[model samples]
Target: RLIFDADWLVPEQVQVAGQAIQYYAARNIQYVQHPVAAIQVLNVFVPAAYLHGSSVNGYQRATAPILMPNTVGGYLPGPADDPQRVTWPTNAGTIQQALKRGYVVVAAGIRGRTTVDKSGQRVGQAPAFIVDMKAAIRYVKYNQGRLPGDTNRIITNGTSAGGATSALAGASGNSAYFEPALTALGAAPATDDIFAVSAYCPIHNLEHADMAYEWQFNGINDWHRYQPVAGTTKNGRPKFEPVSGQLTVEEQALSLALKAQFSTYLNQLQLTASDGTHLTLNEAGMGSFRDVVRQLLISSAQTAFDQGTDIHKYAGFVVTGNQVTDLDLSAYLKSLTRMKAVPAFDQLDLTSPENNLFGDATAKAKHFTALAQTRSTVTAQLADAELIQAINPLSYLTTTSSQVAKHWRIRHGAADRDTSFAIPIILAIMLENHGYGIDFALPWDIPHSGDYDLGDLFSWIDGLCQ
Candidate 1:
């Protein structure tokens, strides 16, 4: 065996989107390693931000030194051409605060949406978001001179989209596609068995009933009362022109029926149309117009899905109560065809004549079905209750397996509008239900903003380190 100097930096960097990001190694001098029992420990952090050219700068500016026995890595993936680079965030005020309290910090920037190939079209849901996070974990382990990162004790934390990605990483677990970059590194192929996770308003299930309210309409309450109506009719005539400049007979009839039902339902729910028009529902003594409106949209969505159209693009109106009518159904069906030929209507817009009539039944139906399938898949993939209990971070008084401590805390600004705080709160509930130890905090006056106090976070980490 040839003797080698111990001070050389590791030569393992993966090329992504035509450029290479270097991985650095830091040694743990306080802990003594048994020759036979030496374990490589690594910690990784994933950042969350839009596809703007600021990821690397964000990571470097946010990172702090670890106070424990692990090598911390921050994964930053931003613009395709020039990834920003900056000094890691001075942990002295944050991670360092935890370190002083006895916790090790690891941070890295995960590849983001902006890092995609310039020539490639937009990537859809699954692989695009999930894969980058998995890659960051593996990068720190295989690179020589890097701490022998523990594969089993990983803990992920983030706020907003970053928080959502972290949740996906934990929920996706051992899947190969989600973490292809990790395989590229020489790190052992291992499933991400994150011990603990903390999220600040994470976007949990996309199919949750409240998704439209939180992400689209600002909240469920708001969506019920104030959503945009795309298609409607004026005195039996189409109010909005179709893309083909004229509505076909079938389309005209469908648009009329849908508009009738939508308008009537909005009146019942006291909802405002996108154009700021208030609905006028019939009184109880006369007849409940709200029920008629509800059924009309529901039926229309089912019909659209049966016809094989994307329901999300069409279903803009929501019905809160259960009373419905036959006229409502007839009007909804007619409006469907009326807006088919409309120009500038590629899913986002429907002519004003098409208001309330274009319910997204197909998307809703598909979403519900997919959610059921996913739940089943998760049940099959997860370990037994006993195994889950054993691995649960909350069970340990002091965690040593690189798994995070159970006392993880997650907080979100109650006033946040970006994610509507629904996704994050939902994620926290899921983790708690799954036996993970976590705490949630929502400041009443906080708005939809970024950069809040990490003091509670440091305290949680410090408690775990002890």
Candidate 2:
């Protein structure tokens, strides 16, 4: 019932690094028929060049790919990006670059766990964010020719929790699992499948995140967690003050126990490397999988070295003849320090955001993993099992439902201790095994951030769209 109205767009101009950008804007367009919350809306921006019948990077209004970027971070409700109130540093930010490329950009306001209804009840919980996004996609698809961009070429971009949601949206497109929710929400009767996905440091596969984190940093008991201090940097970024600490003896024991669970979970997947090597782990959680991770680090370092950066400063990297011959994974990880403690995602006290993510309308937070539930220190409750499964991209990918995107570009920075390297590596391999086009990498010395490398990102998008 919510048909897109082209007349809703209002023209506006914003200056980015002294360059004026003119575009047609539409905000707070509801995707659902009967919206319950104010956060269920989206904003659209069409490049002025497109409306003028001009092209950027060989793409016009009818041909340009639609870029969908979510503002959800830390599973909090996100409003659409207000171009009127924001300006980017030159061409660095995601939305600005997308507009500059002449692509139709949409930033949907996704409802997160923190969203509340008029009745004072938490309305946006697990699957609400994803359901809202799927509805937004359907809205875009339903518009078709009325929209400026090509419906078939929509691409989703996000970082961290938003990134994970992007991966889920791409993988679970048109699956029957969401039909009941979609029907209840009165979503547009259109397909939600996407053409490509760009996820930066996506914190997905939540049920297994703790196990993976422990596996990666089993022996590394001491670490530093970055906390934002009082002030902002010159570029308007938060200045994080590093707080160092060592895990207690009990926590260290728990770390080893959690680490041991990963090998069985990993090996059961039967994932294979690009070289056809069966990526598996031994009883000690050491095998070809570890080697593959090491190789990926070497590749990252080599790429950085080739770009004229001094690899000699990285004490963990072994440079031989201008090539990174090897990498000490533990040493490198220790240098960065472990950012989280034992049982990272599903903490025993049910303190993590992911725990709250699995919460229902009644309970504020619940444990989603069996091990965590069994070992919980407090009187914690377990979330519905299927609800936990509903949020995982890996589950949908393995089950093979809906239309999975053929093109993917995933980047989890090597220095980012937010999650294990295993997370993104497994995702890339799984995508490759399914014969999807995947360009995955652990960028050298990058942190837990997104939209940094816009030039390379747009280049990849061009390769796909053109």
Candidate 3:
């Protein structure tokens, strides 16, 4: 069961019809059971200004302050064997502090494995998870009797995938497809196109799956394959096995399109090939050749089975444990060895004089190869030079009429091994471009465990609320 504890500070004002309505805003003291085993109970602290009859101008003039909830705090998936053993890095402490400062706080958990929905299906992705959050918001505003919860003021803040989801909710107005209950709330669906967004590390673009930035956010590269590279055969064309045979022209074209689409899907999920290269189903790219192709074939057979197609049956497709065992050695070796180790490590030493000798040469070669291959394929798709111009993200970002924000901040741990402080700096630039105010501070002689000052964030929030 979830429990909430309130510790209010300054009084908050609720807005109704564009005017300030005084009421005592107290924390929401309740717990809710979501379809999944995951449950969220907020330590809500509603300001006294939200209480009934406390308003000088009564309910007619009152306005609502949208309560923003941070999504980084909660249990995340663990190892495959023990998915129940989740991990929580940052807890509710940060949002709890915000609650004490007179903002309504709601902590939510997306549906996780082992959780069941009303339909008795296992709770997992969209609609189910997001719907649960929408319900929690409704419960807090109306059921909890908090007068200060200016439902209009509810916004969302998060990091990583959480940040991506928050951004989708705020910008896409896509919540209606998930929760129909919002229609009955009498209040507009809490799509609450976020008035202000605070994203620590957001996943901005998914099209560039092979980028270093993709690895930083997802721990994998080549997350998506929506648009296939031209002329490339899936499962790596020029079949490695005598059993599989060769691809026809039509089959090759279809395979390229399918691979690209698959790549795009993976990109959205932040997944990359084991070798951190373009995810290739065929034997030619990197790592295990035949073994990877075999798995792809098995997966394709399964899809055919699910679709009730006779193709697999006619082909007599049967994957056995012996076949898996045969592939095990190659798969094991590939998994054990680092695919992008040299490149990832090289990037780390880019500033070193020793790396200068060969690093630049290696990078240039890789980039040239990629550009050449891309150009050849895209040119095949569109003969005209102008038509081929639509291939690159760099051109799209620069030429398109879109609002982009850039904010930059850099901080580092003296002994960080996984990621450098350079990440934060890049993110700061992204946030600033979005018009966010930033505070930069670097503490000397501090180890990785040193405390960080968030005075700037507080000051910025204060300014917005005032």
Candidate 4:
């Protein structure tokens, strides 16, 4: 059995945000009893005050929440992060900051879609990443007394695909979806459930992501991407080219077809807003759901305007009396360059990163959706429906049997076009409807990134812990 050693921690200090963060670090600890791959390991950092029975930020050793951050991006393998080397997306709200606030940070290394076992078999596919995360959580819970933080107060955090991981780990909890994989991996004999999840721009609900993407951007037929080059802008942001392209006639038709399906899906969900307004869509894919999305954009624009950004510089937002009241969403959507082509997630070519995510040991990549399979340009097989469901957080969340996390903090930046707004919106609505406490927002003008607002994040976690 894998055991956590208190003495294994090496005391260290780092300068973060003009403050010195003193913590004890332990790296490369395998969470599972029998490791099948090199990526199945985890790292932990504890505040220095734990040794003297002291407290920092009002959290004692027994009370501090454990923050498990996943680094998986684009479903790529995430090794244990080195505290000294890991770079935060922004200066604010970093892991060192979490340590300074007396939170125990646990960075777990997880296998991703591209990982292959020593046997040269594709071991890291559809369910492997979440399985690894669950095993890591189970490890932390199993070593409760030996660990410094509260095992029951563990918080899962991530961004992009990593965000999807955090959401799935939090939502699925001890569901039977991962039992077979966990058993095969020889994970610890402990519960894999967690208490909270903080996801930023999570590209989840993969099978439906394409439909949602089309639903949001169907009429807008052009696309462009920012490619980083070797220079920096005056704003200290990386310089890149706004590479542009237009959709073909076939792609446009596909977009319209996909957009049509979203209304049916939304109607089936029967979701409601905070004010009890039904988020249902009409045959034209317009309704309270679109209204809520427009309102969220308005809120985002208002926040940015209040923060001194020139919201008037944008094409569609209407500001009057220094207040953002309405937004011509179509105009704004057209203004911001679209990132991907029609059928964003499940490309007919089977080359999307998500397609690789659903691949099995034999196939390198496969179409995970029926629509994609039917429209595939290349010869490919469809991914198993059960396997697709295993990676989908919505599947587990729809059922009451799953031991879902009670607290959720979901954020999708208003400027983020990585995935559809509907994805995270539906997620938050589902969690809220399930009687869970969810703090969800379309953060103002933020892009497709995470941990930018760590101060707010930690405060939310602090509020929950207290």
Candidate 5:
């Protein structure tokens, strides 16, 4: 069992993002039940300046909000950020900036698909990551008065897979389903709900991502792999060259099938726009849902135009006209095409990184979707449904448990092909439909990464925190 000791909090200096800062705590705080599970924990930082009765940017921060960030990707176990070097690329800046602003920071580590116990039992699979996140929160809340910041105003943040965990944690607060797991770990009785969430390019909705990705990129046959030549020391951070997407005929066929299956799924969502337009798959995927996406693209272009990007440099847009007020949606999207092949997430060979995300005690990858399961022809049973539900923010958005975040800030690069733009947008729309405050934007031109535009992100947080 993990116990909270005041001695665990220590004074230290650290590097956050790129800046050096001072804080009150600097070590790992164990957050789970059993012995080995202690690795599932969080690293904390409290503002030294704030504790000194000083004001940052003219605001008293004794009640400042906390930023809860994670570092997991591809469903892999992650280390908690060292308080001295916590960097957040998605929202830009580092934990240093937040602390400088008098905000508390908690960076948590999570058990992933491959995490195991001392006895060789897999403890970090599917629900484990999400469960561990909640347990971390419980630990934070259980500390209550001992912590420097406002417990009721905790905000969550992360990028890609880490972002997916943020969304899930925000959306599923206090859900009874996770209660059993929390209890098993002896998580504190405090509620695990957060006040707000910011997710960037989250690779989520796994069971359906294959279909969604193909629906948008099936015809995009030009795929490439540019690596750093060969074995040039891992971490050499090499560049890439264009090799064919390396897709086989069978994979091509799989992409087509998945694309067709997406329309049915889209039709079932029945999602609508603020103008009451429905998400339809009838017109080249341009039903109301598709239109919503087109609108987002146009607005993003307009934002670029507003920000003084030379819109006319490309032929895909009608830049001579007002930016958002007048846009050429179709041509704009054509400029930057799809990034992945069909069945991008659940491959026939079952080797997509996400396939690896379902790794169990005995296997490295397992099919999460039915179509991929049938095509892969692996005798291994399909990963259970819980794996899908655990990471998908959509699962708990509706019928949300008691503590869903009241506000959500979601952003994706319009051209990011790592996952379909639809993935993040749909999540935005779903939350908007459910009456949460949503700030959704498609940045002008972004790729499959994060840590862009630190200023804008900080501004948004400031407004919400206020």
Candidate 6:
């Protein structure tokens, strides 16, 4: 086995989200290796004592909870942890907060869909990231008391694809499906099961995201959007690429067709509303599930109005005086504009970012569903059912004995069209059905993002650990 002295240290004190934090930084620590590609390192941060000073925030951290967070998005390749930025953002970031609050933070560097090895082999693909995360957990757990904080309370955090895998990390703890892969990695001889999970704006349920996307925006074809990514000429800033919001006739037919099959999948699950009400729509993409989602929106609006906040700007919502009597769910969703068009996720053209995520050395994009396969004009092969199911957290629920986290905090912005709101909501429902504690919400006015509510997030973590 490869070896390194565990006493190594790299120290620093830097500003995070405007606050100065003194931290002991460990950069580029290899969590595991596959003899390959560009992404394979992780960073760790701790409040400085002799390296700097006792943390200004408070207390004995000898047994503090470990805060594990990642920075992954789009399933595209990128570093999982950055030591310089890991511990200072107080606004939406939480590294500095965790350190001050007397917690150890382990940031991981995992592979993505396009990662390659030195031998010219595909190293990071469908389930590589998940496997990497499990190794990170197992590495930490194998160290036991040798590492900082309690091993039993590792709390994971991530945004987007990072969020998806963080949720996957929580839900798929020690499932047998991953064992064969984990064993091959020469992983630590310790269980990878974690204690809790925090995911924000996670784009998950990929194979089915297409149906969910259409169910929410079927009638609305044209998807107009404005972005600030151009030359500083006209507006002296970035401008958006012009797009036609209209979908083709074939695209429209595909939308309605996919939306219909959604129910068959729904009726098969054991999920429910906050009150235990279950319907096929609960299975739309909502039968009465639609009302359940709207009620939350109405409730959020009512709370805003009660607190003397103006919600009239949201004209799309049919607010009844101070109470929201009705809401055009799809209309409101459309306002977010189309993050994806017809054949949203598993596009027949095979140009979507997700397609790149599932590709390997032999092919660049393959179909994850029979629907996409039938419509393809390109030579698209169907992705393996096992590989497809392995990456989805839902597959682990009914089939594995993994030690799933009991506490979960899932939030997606009301305006986030990155994927359907149904994806995260359905995920929460499935986990709840299995008796896990879920703090699920579609926070009002949030966009395709996360880390916006750091205070409440850790506050929730504190309650869980306390």
Against the hidden reference, what TM-scores do the models get? 0.42, 0.95, 0.39, 0.95, 0.89, 0.89
- Sorted on lDDT, best first, the list reads 4, 2, 6, 5, 1, 3
Please give, for residues 1-466, the per-residue lDDT of candidate 1 as tens digits.
Answer: 1111224323333343464534333322211111111122223221221112132322221232232211111112321111121233212233323322223235443333223233542221123334444444443322313332233344566655555555555555454333343443333443444545655555433333222221222111111112224543442222443223444464344333433343333344333333545435332211333342344345544544555554443223343333212334223223222212311111122222111111121211111222223433222221123322222222232223333334345665634443333335434544454456767655533543333666656555545533
Poorly placed runs, candidate 4 (over 4 Å)? 87-93, 227-242, 274-277
lDDT, candidate 4, 1-466, per-residue tens:
6889999998999887687888899888988877778989988899999877999999999989999988888897877665665342222246788899899988888898888888878888878889999999999998998988999999999899999999999988899868888887788889988999999899999989999998899898889887667877763456788787899999999999999999998889888777676778887778889988888888888877888887665578876798887888888888765888978999998888898998887888999889999989999999999878877888877786579999999999888999989899999888898788899999877889888888899899999998
The residue-by-residue lDDT of candidate 5 on 305-348, one tens digit each, is: 78778555444555445645544544554456656666778876
Q: Count the backbone clashes (under 3 Å) in each candidate.
A: 59, 0, 57, 0, 8, 14
Q: In model 4, what are the clashing residue pairs, if there are any? A: none
Q: Between the candidate structures 1 and 3, which one is better when assessed by lDDT?
A: 1
Candidate 5, position 347, lDDT: 71
lDDT: which is higher, 1 or 4?
A: 4
Residues 1-466 of candidate 3: C-alpha lDDT, one tens digit per residue: 3222233423555443464533233332333433233333333434344443233212211443444443431112111110111233333344434443445444444432234445664443222333444555554445333334555545555544344334434432323333443343232222333344444433323223223322222222211112223443442222222111233454334334433443343334322343454332222222332234335434434544455554322222454532322223233222222122212222222321112211121131111122223433222211223212222112222333222222222333212212222233333433433444543332222223211333544445555655
lDDT of 6 at 366: 82
lDDT of 4 at 77: 81
Number of clashes found in candidate 2: 0
Q: What do the candidate models score in CA lDDT, each in turn? A: 0.34, 0.85, 0.34, 0.86, 0.74, 0.74
Best by lDDT: 4
Clashing pairs in 2: none
User: How far does residue 141 in candidate 2 sit from its true spot (Å)?
Assistant: 0.4
RMSD of each: 18.5, 2.3, 21.5, 2.8, 3.1, 3.7
Cand. 5 Cα-lDDT = 0.74
